Design a binder for these strands. Structure first.
Ligand SMILES: [Cl-]
Ligand SMILES: [Cl-]
Ligand SMILES: [Cl-]
Ligand SMILES: [Cl-]
Ligand SMILES: [K+]
Ligand SMILES: [Mg+2]
Ligand SMILES: [Mg+2]
Ligand SMILES: [Mg+2]
Ligand SMILES: [Mg+2]
Ligand SMILES: [Mg+2]
Ligand SMILES: [Mg+2]
Ligand SMILES: [Mg+2]
Ligand SMILES: [Mg+2]
Ligand SMILES: [Mg+2]
Ligand SMILES: [Mg+2]
Ligand SMILES: [Mg+2]
Ligand SMILES: [Mg+2]
Ligand SMILES: [Mg+2]
Ligand SMILES: [Mg+2]
Ligand SMILES: [Mg+2]
Ligand SMILES: [Mg+2]
Ligand SMILES: [Mg+2]
Ligand SMILES: [Mg+2]
Ligand SMILES: [Mg+2]
Ligand SMILES: [Mg+2]
Ligand SMILES: [Mg+2]
Ligand SMILES: [Mg+2]
Ligand SMILES: [Mg+2]
Ligand SMILES: [Mg+2]
Ligand SMILES: [Mg+2]
Ligand SMILES: [Mg+2]
Ligand SMILES: [Mg+2]
Ligand SMILES: [Mg+2]
Ligand SMILES: [Mg+2]
Ligand SMILES: [Mg+2]
Ligand SMILES: [Mg+2]
Ligand SMILES: [Mg+2]
Ligand SMILES: [Mg+2]
Ligand SMILES: [Mg+2]
Ligand SMILES: [Mg+2]
Ligand code: NA
Ligand code: NA
Ligand code: NA
Ligand code: NA
Ligand code: NA
Ligand code: NA
Ligand code: NA
Ligand code: NA
Ligand code: NA
Ligand code: NA
Ligand code: NA
Ligand code: NA
Ligand code: NA
Ligand code: NA
Ligand code: NA
Ligand code: NA
Ligand code: NA
Ligand SMILES: [Sr+2]
Ligand SMILES: [Sr+2]
Ligand SMILES: [Sr+2]
Ligand SMILES: [Sr+2]
Ligand SMILES: [Sr+2]
Ligand SMILES: [Sr+2]
Ligand SMILES: [Sr+2]
Ligand SMILES: [Sr+2]
Ligand SMILES: [Sr+2]
Ligand SMILES: [Sr+2]
Ligand SMILES: [Sr+2]
Ligand SMILES: [Sr+2]
Ligand SMILES: [Sr+2]
Ligand SMILES: [Sr+2]
Ligand SMILES: [Sr+2]
Ligand SMILES: [Sr+2]
Ligand SMILES: [Sr+2]
Ligand SMILES: [Sr+2]
Ligand SMILES: [Sr+2]
Ligand SMILES: [Sr+2]
Ligand SMILES: [Sr+2]
Ligand SMILES: [Sr+2]
Ligand SMILES: [Sr+2]
Ligand SMILES: [Sr+2]
Ligand SMILES: [Sr+2]
Ligand SMILES: [Sr+2]
Ligand SMILES: [Sr+2]
Ligand SMILES: [Sr+2]
Ligand SMILES: [Sr+2]
Ligand SMILES: [Sr+2]
Ligand SMILES: [Sr+2]
Ligand SMILES: [Sr+2]
Ligand SMILES: [Sr+2]
Ligand SMILES: [Sr+2]
Ligand SMILES: [Sr+2]
Ligand SMILES: [Sr+2]
Ligand SMILES: [Sr+2]
Ligand SMILES: [Sr+2]
Ligand SMILES: [Sr+2]
Ligand SMILES: [Sr+2]
Ligand SMILES: [Sr+2]
Ligand SMILES: [Sr+2]
Ligand SMILES: [Sr+2]
Ligand SMILES: [Sr+2]
Ligand SMILES: [Sr+2]
Ligand SMILES: [Sr+2]
Ligand SMILES: [Sr+2]
Lengths: 56, 73, 237
RNA sequence: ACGACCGUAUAGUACGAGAGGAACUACGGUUGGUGGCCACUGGUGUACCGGUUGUUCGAGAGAGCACGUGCCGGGUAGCCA
RNA sequence: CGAGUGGCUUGCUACCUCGAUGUCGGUUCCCUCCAUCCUGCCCGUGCAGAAGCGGGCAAGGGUGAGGUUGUUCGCCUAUUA
RNA sequence: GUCGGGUGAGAACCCCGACGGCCUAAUGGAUAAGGGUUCCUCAGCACUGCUGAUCAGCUGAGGGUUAGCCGGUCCUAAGUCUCACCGCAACUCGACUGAGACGAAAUGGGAAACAGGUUAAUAUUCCUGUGCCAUCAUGCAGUGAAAGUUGACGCCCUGGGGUCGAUCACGCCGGGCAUCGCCCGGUCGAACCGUCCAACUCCGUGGAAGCCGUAAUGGCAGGAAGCGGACGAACGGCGGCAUAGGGAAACGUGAUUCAACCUGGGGCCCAUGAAAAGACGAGCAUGAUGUCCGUACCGAGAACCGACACAGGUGUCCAUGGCGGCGAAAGCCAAGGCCUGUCGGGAGCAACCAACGUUAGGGAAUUCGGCAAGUUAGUCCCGUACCUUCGGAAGAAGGGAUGCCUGCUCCGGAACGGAGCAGGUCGCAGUGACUCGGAAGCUCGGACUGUCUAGUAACAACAUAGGUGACCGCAAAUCCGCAAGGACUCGUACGGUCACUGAAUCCUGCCCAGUGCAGGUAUCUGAACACCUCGUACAAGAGGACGAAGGACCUGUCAACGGCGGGGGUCUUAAGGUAGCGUAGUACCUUGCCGCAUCAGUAGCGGCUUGCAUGAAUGGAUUAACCAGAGCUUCACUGUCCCAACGUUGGGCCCGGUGAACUGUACAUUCCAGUGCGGAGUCUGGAGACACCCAGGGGGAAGCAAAGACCCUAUGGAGCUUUACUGCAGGCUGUCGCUGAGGACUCUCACUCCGGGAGGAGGACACCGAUAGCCGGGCA
RNA sequence: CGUGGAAGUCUGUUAGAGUUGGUGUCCUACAAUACCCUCUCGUGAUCUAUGUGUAGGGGUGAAAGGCCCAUCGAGUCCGGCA
């Protein structure tokens, strides 16, 4: 069984869903954590300085 | 009895299994009554088909050399 | 390199854990205040997944139903006593002080009240040798002379299921079923059969530990493999 | 687009004490190569005719399917060696 | 001992090629060379004959099948002009 | 697919009929995930669709999913999160312990619904008929109420009960066929309410000393059979339900084999096969309440994932439709579905290619190699070697039989079950297709089943049982974390950790010098603090005394790393290779020598063997069995070959339609020589050369595809190693603080551990903070 | 002689799992791992669905440097960064 096309057929698991807090399809329904805004992980909003160039 | 093993494993393994299961399957004298009606129910568990006496003993024999020593002292 | 298997174990992930959710109970001695007026009846004999040996279900006078580390010879209907004034009989529990010298014992406590630590596996037994007002000398299954507090509780007789070790597994599948009931990663891949990155003995064309196996006691984890602080090796000498 | 060989007559002759043993020339055939042809022999021939197994069309008759013929036997033309 | 020719072996060089020109052997198919193994025509002989042996002209045609080994090579077998 | 026809401006592919076909664990039916309107209707063809299109999963416009009793919702599983507590510089981080919540839609547990009718599209939801559950209210009864039972459970073999289905017998209703008289379909009817009860268990009677009983095990004076009785089953039987429903009609009755479902007996475990909510226990009438969320459709060779309407991938159930046969096998056929694994037209349709059929004689001569193909084949009877771990080898081998028809016999209750006999008779051929082993010997390797490089390696590699060594008494050994803490562990030496070897069998020699580990150690060496001397009004600093682990030194140890030679009739550096095996998967020389086998054998096997450079758990030897493992031989067989032929299907060629990509400095009709950075279509000299187009196999363009897959270079990178350099974790050891009272000691009061508690054990140690010395590829 | 029905037991395209050889077909593919035949396993160290856990010098690994979403002798993303 190849890692490519043949293995893509088994993909029918729902994980990332629309997030109640930010509206992005990043709420991981299994972990119950939003990979975009961090809902379910932190009260504060997920944010990082590396999300932009250093001097901007 | 090790005929279920076929031509596999070698003499010693299936010689010991044979001798052990031979003695294990024998008619064992019940501690309660005197009848040779004790059978194994599982690992170290024995029971008499006559009086229904369920008791502990060796894994393959209802009595071990060590267990027989307890009585004396 | 990469952490060796022995280090992966420590993390306590699923692969290395024991099937605790499947286990029955810790066969600790009952806690009696005093008077010894605690006796019970063996209601059933059960198989213990954690020790591959039979264990006994007892129903005590005060209404307590508990599983007991059963010696050989215990059967349903039999009455068991636990306490200072307990009768000197197989399956009965009482402190070492009340036990007569030269009597096989099992499930011996390390510190009075702990519930039993020594001599608990299939067929084994400790031997109560010397008595005293301050110390009870017991010979453990390993042959070691152990000095214990005479107040330490123990059960008279040898542990049930003796001779278990006498029959060979014969096949891998049999070992397999047993290992599923324990906290152990099995089968076992030899160090010498792995890559250099995975173990101190890995690498090199043909297989061989490119170094002496006797490792120091002070060796750090990851390096402490092979023959740990061996006083000697081999069969000769 | 023809190359080569074997055999027979020459001849048990010439030669040679003997043993052995030629040639010119005339013939017959083989082999390798070459071009073409199917009367003959052989192959094929899911044209065709026959036998026959399972199943379906109620039987019979007559058929379908079982790979480009279910399987088996024979084989015209044609193409072939 | 001396003088040469070839470019089939090996060595030497590093001139061409590393933003890549697919190694050996075999197979299949085509052309060629001559330092000729056979075949044609010759000369000598320590050429009677038969057969050898050595040499000359000559590249039209031919030079096959098999056993071990990947082998090229080579050893081996029976055929062969 | 074809012939007719329908609609339309237009029809090969949209629809009707006929004829011809395809799918049968699926190409049919119901669904989980996932998709999200793809579902239904009307109107369309610019877009999407491998051609066309009036069609559509496409475009436009509307419409469509109805629940007390089907899921959800409730329960708890592995496990997750939150809060508290604690750690952390800190947190959105981290372990424990408490509490709370979360965690199962086919497929865990679970109160209750069936039949029919209806729509373009829903349907146990709507409608009709009937039924049922829970809660609450009212009324009667009830004083019982919580013990117990249930929910609730592994694997293997098996009996009994029994429905559907299928089949047989006969009747009825309807259809088909038309030499016969046979062939097909139907013959219905639920939940629920009521009732019946086999098995198991128990009681009474009885009184077996050999009887009772089973498919099998088994049972009994501790009371067998027999007899009577209590408790007690089906999704089953029976009655109601039902002058309900359904059917054009009839509107059956018996039987066998019996999936579901019910209930028993036996066996296995170094393996022991959830939990919780809930339910029963615990009556009946009447009435009220039963909200919220899901509900369409696809579920795949076009609705999912794979960029696609992709030959891939993707869970569950329909596992009992007929013939066939051992069969959930093949093949053929129903019910049902489809002609969309969606471009067509034409040429006896050439070469060439893909898949195939058939080939005389020879029969492996082909090839590295029987690669490919083929041979054999089902079942019954006879018969079956070496070797063997006694299991096996074995379907060894080898030999014979096999259909149809007529009449029978035996086993069984019987089968539409099985085993045979006699007679008759057809073919080239009777397992007639289909299904369906070729066989034998020798050698190497690994014992065996098992594992593996998703995507060039399935093996001799990994694993394994078995053998062995090492560590540790549990306040342990080993391991994770900075810490709080944690895995092992509901574990305790018959344990579990760390390693090596690799079934059985016979065995496993010598070496402790080096290295490693461990123990000991008079003496030597060995840091810091404190102490002492000098120095400084102090301090830096110099020296001294004491000296832990460590080292020196001694000892133990090879199933510890490893070693087992050269020379001579010892030497390096400890020993100097024992049993066995041996030209080996190890032997360079080498195609070693002898032999076997062959016409011929660098192969293979046997023997020899001084072994360039075998050898004993770096395991040696040996080995039955096993193997898509390497090599060799034989029989059988055949187009592998001699040497090729003919044929079949799909392409290829021609026509309609659709319609890319690779590649492209330029020029370019070349050929032979030469020259040139020595490998030129383009330079030179000659030769040849009228242009364009079709088909072809690929000689050349050092053809196209990639800033090699070999080599070197760079004060390039990375992974790996170690007695490289330098450091860092970690362990050990001393010292200071925690830390108290009276080079050796006692105590208790901190602190630690055990204990539910009282209290016990220990104790100024240990833990922890700081520092010092040693070890330190575990890590950078 | 029968009964019994054991087995990491045998045959087997039952379901299901896998992949020895053809170095077949394909190789601007149906397909960035496909097709066909042959072949292996198929009561167990079996296969399989969903849920759940382990995370990057870290997992997981019957060990092949295998696997951790077409990439692994150290994933992916963005940032350091021109
Ligand atoms: Cl074990
Ligand atoms: Cl010949
Ligand atoms: Cl639902
Ligand atoms: Cl029974
Ligand atoms: K190059
Ligand atoms: Mg316990
Ligand atoms: Mg496990
Ligand atoms: Mg191993
Ligand atoms: Mg390796
Ligand atoms: Mg390493
Ligand atoms: Mg080794
Ligand atoms: Mg150069
Ligand atoms: Mg090139
Ligand atoms: Mg010449
Ligand atoms: Mg010539
Ligand atoms: Mg329409
Ligand atoms: Mg519908
Ligand atoms: Mg299609
Ligand atoms: Mg022939
Ligand atoms: Mg040849
Ligand atoms: Mg073959
Ligand atoms: Mg009869
Ligand atoms: Mg060999
Ligand atoms: Mg193997
Ligand atoms: Mg691979
Ligand atoms: Mg394999
Ligand atoms: Mg072992
Ligand atoms: Mg062991
Ligand atoms: Mg090994
Ligand atoms: Mg091995
Ligand atoms: Mg030899
Ligand atoms: Mg040794
Ligand atoms: Mg390059
Ligand atoms: Mg490169
Ligand atoms: Mg390289
Ligand atoms: Mg250099
Ligand atoms: Mg580097
Ligand atoms: Mg504690
Ligand atoms: Mg390093
Ligand atoms: Mg899973
Ligand atoms: Na020269
Ligand atoms: Na070549
Ligand atoms: Na010539
Ligand atoms: Na040869
Ligand atoms: Na009933
Ligand atoms: Na059938
Ligand atoms: Na079409
Ligand atoms: Na197997
Ligand atoms: Na040594
Ligand atoms: Na050696
Ligand atoms: Na295998
Ligand atoms: Na052929
Ligand atoms: Na070309
Ligand atoms: Na690297
Ligand atoms: Na028997
Ligand atoms: Na394959
Ligand atoms: Na990394
Ligand atoms: Sr899935
Ligand atoms: Sr969170
Ligand atoms: Sr931020
Ligand atoms: Sr405990
Ligand atoms: Sr406890
Ligand atoms: Sr190594
Ligand atoms: Sr020894
Ligand atoms: Sr003549
Ligand atoms: Sr003569
Ligand atoms: Sr046909
Ligand atoms: Sr046949
Ligand atoms: Sr010449
Ligand atoms: Sr000549
Ligand atoms: Sr050469
Ligand atoms: Sr040679
Ligand atoms: Sr369906
Ligand atoms: Sr149009
Ligand atoms: Sr539609
Ligand atoms: Sr819930
Ligand atoms: Sr359910
Ligand atoms: Sr099962
Ligand atoms: Sr039955
Ligand atoms: Sr529906
Ligand atoms: Sr499919
Ligand atoms: Sr596939
Ligand atoms: Sr049909
Ligand atoms: Sr189409
Ligand atoms: Sr024919
Ligand atoms: Sr051959
Ligand atoms: Sr040959
Ligand atoms: Sr035969
Ligand atoms: Sr061996
Ligand atoms: Sr695999
Ligand atoms: Sr052995
Ligand atoms: Sr030593
Ligand atoms: Sr020797
Ligand atoms: Sr010119
Ligand atoms: Sr072409
Ligand atoms: Sr099997
Ligand atoms: Sr099989
Ligand atoms: Sr291959
Ligand atoms: Sr083939
Ligand atoms: Sr193809
Ligand atoms: Sr490919
Ligand atoms: Sr079976
Ligand atoms: Sr990706
Ligand atoms: Sr950057």
């Amino acid at each position: 069984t190849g890692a490519g096309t043949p293995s893509q057929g088994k993909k029918n698991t729902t994980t990332h869903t629309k997030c109640r807090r930010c509206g992005e399809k990043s709420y991981h329904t299994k972990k119950k954590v939003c990979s975009s805004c961090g809902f379910g992980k932190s009260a504060k909003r997920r944010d990082y300085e590396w999300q932009s160039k250093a001097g901007e | 009895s090790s005929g279920r093993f076929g031509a596999r494993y070698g003499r010693v393994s299936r010689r010991r299994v044979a001798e052990i299961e031979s003695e294990m399957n024998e008619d064992h004298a019940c501690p309660n009554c005197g009848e040779d009606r004790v059978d194994r129910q599982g690992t170290g568990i024995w029971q008499c088909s006559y009086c229904d006496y369920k008791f502990t003993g060796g894994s393959y024999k209802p009595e071990t050399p060590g267990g027989k020593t307890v009585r004396r002292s | 390199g990469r952490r060796i298997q022995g280090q992966r174990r420590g993390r306590g992930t699923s692969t290395f854990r024991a099937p605790s959710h499947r286990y029955k109970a810790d066969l600790e001695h009952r806690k009696v205040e005093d008077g010894d007026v605690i006796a019970g009846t063996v209601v059933d004999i059960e198989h213990d997944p954690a020790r591959s040996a039979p264990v006994a279900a007892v129903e005590f006078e005060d209404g307590d139903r508990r599983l007991i580390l059963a010696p050989e010879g215990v059967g349903v209907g039999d009455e068991l006593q636990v306490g200072v004034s307990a009768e000197i009989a197989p399956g009965n529990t009482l402190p070492l002080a009340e036990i007569p010298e030269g009597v096989p014992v099992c499930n011996v406590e390390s510190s009075p009240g702990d519930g039993g630590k020594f001599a608990r596996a299939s067929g084994v037994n400790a031997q109560l040798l010397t008595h005293d007002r301050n110390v009870a000398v017991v010979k453990l299954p390993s042959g070691e002379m152990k000095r214990l507090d005479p107040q330490c509780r123990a059960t008279i007789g040898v542990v049930a299921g003796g001779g278990r070790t006498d029959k060979p597994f014969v096949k891998a599948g049999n070992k397999h079923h047993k290992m599923k009931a324990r906290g152990t990663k099995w089968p076992n891949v030899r160090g010498v059969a792995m890559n250099a990155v995975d173990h101190p003995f890995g690498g090199g064309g043909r297989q061989h530990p490119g170094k002496p196996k006797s490792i120091s006691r002070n060796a750090p984890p990851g390096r402490k493999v092979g023959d740990i602080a061996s006083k000697r090796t081999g069969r000769g000498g």
